[PDB]
Symmetry: C7
Subunit: 265 residues, 7 copies
């Protein structure tokens, strides 16, 4: 458990804490270039125009190529989705299989005092592998949650990895007010090369979590291999090895492992 | 219980957390286009005019077709209604039937130790199906709350689903100050093509919860089918199967399910 | 109890939560129309003038008919009164009759173990209806609190129901500064058709709680009818039926209702 | 106790909650009328001048009659005094006489089990009225705190009641800057009919608590009459009746009042 | 104890709560009179000039007489000192003599059960006055903390009492920028009759705590007199009377004072 | 302990509470004098220029003598250092020697009940001075933390004490924009006698803590003298006297000090 | 443990508290020099331009040498990384080896009462060094976390140490709007010597933590030397010495170390 929950707790809580660091350095959200002192107010109107006129205009105003890419408005918004999706395979196990393993935790904790009174009787335990001999496909339904997470992190690396090639010239563009021209056709200049503010801290934020999660993806692959190096294949590890390790989950007893020092001599 | 409460808790708390994400990115609420520097103040007066002059003007100022559709002013407001309505069939069961099942939880917990002392006596339980033989229509009054929720999510999909076809050109419109013209008929220009700000993040917010709740609607249909695949029809499942599963609600005992491993050998 | 407290707790806490939703969307409170750039400050003075000059001017400045109707300045203020008045008949019972029924809760809880040791003796309860034979008019003083609430909700429906007919043209009006003219009679124009901002969200807020409380008024009428369908009239229900149901208030015992399954066989 | 503490707790906590409702609708505090765009700043200087020049100017600038009435600057400030003064006769009793009655609570709780073992002995209490036969003037020192509160609420009704006759024309007045004229005698106009903002919500706030406390003043008069209707006059009620009722303060016992149902038969 | 701690707790916590009431009504801190629209900014510079140029200018700019009286900049600041200084003689006793009296509390609590088993033996206490016969000058070191507080409140009445005679014309004055003239000697006018804002609420705040603490000063004098009216002079009250009253500090026993009712008969 | 922790807790928590009082009265941070209405913005640029151009300019712009004294920008910043440095010799003892004295607290608490059962046996303790006969230089490592604190407070008095002589004319100075002149050499005037705002409340803040800590420095000298007046020199006080006083640290027993009253007679 | 956790807790919590001190003195973030009153708004546009145009412009606009050094935008951002990286080797041990040493804490706590009943038997312990005779390479996996931290602090000293040589002239630079010139080539001047604000408090902040962590780096070197001065080399200290010291971790017993005083005599 605790080899997994080091990842499963600290790493999703890393990214929202990283997401909170963006919120301190917001300041404003976008600026525009007014045409030389026509008001304080209509300049604010033109600035608020194009920031909402990003995605509805299906026409080509950015001349960038694949320019309706929605212009990364959602880096807190998408990271909010990816954080809570990683939170589920812990909580899915926690409310559907962690009580069933807590029964198994109780089931092994009466198995250990059975060895304890056997040593007191030394002054039936061999059946318990036959109690755990069957198929029990519900454990395989538990083990897929680690495989389920691996899909999420992989496309996350594709999602962040597309941004760096996207980060060449995706800040400066042309906007206009076409229907507001259509009401008068008189006074307002058409184009205003406005400029977004987000890429200066976001592009250098997308370096970190990608190269972190790249350096953490083989660890989950390693997590599905400790059952492989312990004498049974993954179709036959069904109950034995995921009970051998979770023997060391809550605690131990006074003669759980001090027997071996007695056994050494 | 816990197969339902995974939906019943996390999914309504999803949408208010989604509703809180809107409140960070409010900024302003609407902008307008002043007629070229007449004041700082009267421009603010004209902007605050039309934002309240949306629904009272029964005349056709938007030339959009069915234009008094109230212009989606209420996406936090309607989602506040739908979140708390889903909260009720948990709380309706929790304050009217969860203590009655807690008595039944006590009633089955004395049934299980009766099997326990029977094994101690091995060193009357057969009557309990006849204790649960009657009609008990109050359980059917409990089971309709899942059916009650299904009505709410269905029209929610109609409510959000109408918005995407609504999202074609429902942002730009014409407004005026007619009675303020009627006081002088002298100076103020009539029409001002103002522009709302909400659709840029709301239309791309209404994608998510609809396609989530579409991918969750057959799960509640599946919830009313585990009584069907367990040897009695829905008119005859009255007490047996909703007590068989809630046997695994709070906890188990040391020989609740370890009997089967003893029974296997 | 719990059939009533579902209404008595959630419904007054509904309306203050609805009242809190108004406070997020305040923004400003009123705007006015200045006469074309005379200052930033004197325009703010004229705007703050008429917002306080609403009710003191007993003259007819609105030409609306019954125009000193105080112009609904108090929708958070009146709802604050109606919320706390519904809070009293719970708390009036809670600090004056709930300990007396808690003594009766203790009085019936020693009556139930008297039946329990009678079953142990099977290996005087018939007197208790004669202990509850008298008039006990203090219970009728308890039961009027439900009738007391019904008066409050009825006139609340009249209060909110008057607003929709009031909502025709009760936003736009004429104001002036008459004594400020009287100091100089020189420069200031008289009338300024200012405009309030509140009706755009308040009129569509008064739809909800009215149609909710209309759909909840017969439930309290139903609450005074469960004593009617249980073999005694309301002058004779005095103690028996309001003790029969509150037997199921705190909890039950192991043979409170499992006797019936023993009695069935 | 609990007949009094329903008033003694909820009613002072009512008025500070009413005082908190003022703080949300502050906005600004006073406005003034500048003489037509001389600065943004000196207009703010003249506005801040007269708001502090209210009470120091002993001359007649308001021409209202008794015009140094300090102009109700202190409605949160005075209500802060009246709220905490009502809080004292609870707390004065709570830290000086409530432990002494808690000893008496212990003293009567050993008197009740003395009746309990007497019924066990049925398978000396008559002395306790002679234990409570003396004068005990300290109880009369307790009972004056209710009389002490009645003085406070009475003059509070005079304080709020003077405001409605005061509310005729106590908002508009004349102010000037006399010494600032005395430095130059050149440029500044003298009088500026400024206008306060507070009376629009305060005068319609002073309706409520006055008519509430008028409808609560005879209740405290009724509180000093339950000792009168129970066979001894107020000079002779000294200990008996204020111990008869506080017998029902904390709790009761299993045969405190179930004796009467045994006594009925 | 509790006759003192009613003063010692509530009265210092009164004044910081009074000090918090100032912080809500701050708004701004000082205003000045600009010379008729030279900038928004340099007017703010001149206003911030003189507010720091109050005390460093040892010259006579106020022409008031004793004009470097520092102009009461410190009414939250000085009240912060006087509040925490009153907090010390509680806390000085609490961390140096309250455990020693808690040992004495334990010492008298074994003296009371010695009387209790003596009544059980009725089915050596006379020595305890001789255990408390000595000088014990450490108790006189405790009793001076009440005398220590009396010095603080007395000069506090002098401190606040000097302010009312100070409050005649200590708000309006003359300021200038002399070295800023010395850089150019060209453009800036010299004098600007600025005006402070603090005296309008502070002078009418200094009425209250003075007349409160005047009406509380003889109570502490009364506190050093209950040892005088109980048969020993203040040089001889050393241990007996400050243990007689603190017998009633924590609690009593079942026969601590019910002995007297047994002794009455 | 408690004679020290009265200083060690309340006095560092005094200064941060004093540091918090500065943060309420910040307002702005510095002002400057613009050259007569060139913009709102470039005036803000010149003001923000020199506030960062304080310490980097190694040239002589202040003509004050030792003018790169960094101009007391750090009075919250330095006081933050001095507060947390005083917090360490408590916490250094608390996590390295307070458990070792808690073992000694346990070690003396079994020594006291050994005297208690000796009195029960009256119906070996003399060895314990020989248990505490050795050198135990770790106690001298504890006692230097009081000496360690004394160094910090002494230079703190030098640090604050240098400020008053510094407070003569260290607010007004000359600044310029030299490289901004170097880009054009055309328009901008060179010098602007700006003015800081901090000394008006800081110089009269540095009076207090200095004269407080001067009046507390001999108390720590007195703290290292109670071992001197109790029959052994500071090289020989090693364990006896710092265990004699901490006998009275947690509590006492029923016959810890009541033996002396038995011993008196 | 506690010799390490004095560093491991207080020193990372030092730097975030130091990081919080920056956030109070933010104010603004950057200023620029407008070209002499062209608007309020376009000046704000040019200022927001270059603050985002820092790192994307790969051209040489600063003429400083290695000028794309990203200009220390990340001093809260980088310190956030270094603080949480130091937090891991505590938490890595805490969730993977602290329960295993808590089992060893239980394992030694039954070893100590074995000595206790041996003294009771005086009215097998010698085997326990042979229970701790093996290799146990997992302890060496624990001890590398101190070595892991030392790498982080070393390059932190390189990171902060590069800043002081960087702090010569890394604040003033040249910026322009090249594509905004490219749209018109008409009106806007090219270069504007803007100026950052951060180095005035940051360069004098980077003094402290570097010279602190330099004065703490040999302490961790000393931490890996207490196993060296206790009779076994670091390849042979495997279990004995890291159990000898953590014997004094939680507590001791009444005869854990009082045996030595018995052993002295």
């Amino acid at each position: 458990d605790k080899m997994v929950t080091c990842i499963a707790v600290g790493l999703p809580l890393l990214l929202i804490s990283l997401a909170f660091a963006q919120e301190i350095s917001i300041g404003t959200q976008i600026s525009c270039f007014s045409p030389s002192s026509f008001s304080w107010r209509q300049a604010a109107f033109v600035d608020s125009y194009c920031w909402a006129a990003v995605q509805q205009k299906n026409s080509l105003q950015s001349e960038s190529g694949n320019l309706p890419l929605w212009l990364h408005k959602f880096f807190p918004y998408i990271l909010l989705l990816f954080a809570i999706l990683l939170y589920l395979p812990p909580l899915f196990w926690r409310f559907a299989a962690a009580p069933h393993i807590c029964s198994d935790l109780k089931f092994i904790m009466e198995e250990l005092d059975k060895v304890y009174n056997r040593a007191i009787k030394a002054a039936i335990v061999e059946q318990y592998l036959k109690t755990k001999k069957n198929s029990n496909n519900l454990i395989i339904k538990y083990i897929s949650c680690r495989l389920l997470t691996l899909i999420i992190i992989l496309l996350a690396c594709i999602y962040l990895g597309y941004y760096f090639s996207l980060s060449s010239l995706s800040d400066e563009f042309v906007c206009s007010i076409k229907s507001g021209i259509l009401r008068n056709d008189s006074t307002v200049p058409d184009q205003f090369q406005c400029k977004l503010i987000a890429v200066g801290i976001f592009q250098l934020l997308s370096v970190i979590n990608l190269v972190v999660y790249v350096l953490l993806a083989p660890v989950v692959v390693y997590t599905l291999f400790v059952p492989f190096r312990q004498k049974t294949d993954v179709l036959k590890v069904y109950e034995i090895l995921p009970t051998f390790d979770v023997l060391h989950f809550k605690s131990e007893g006074y003669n759980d492992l001090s027997l071996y020092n007695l056994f050494l001599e």
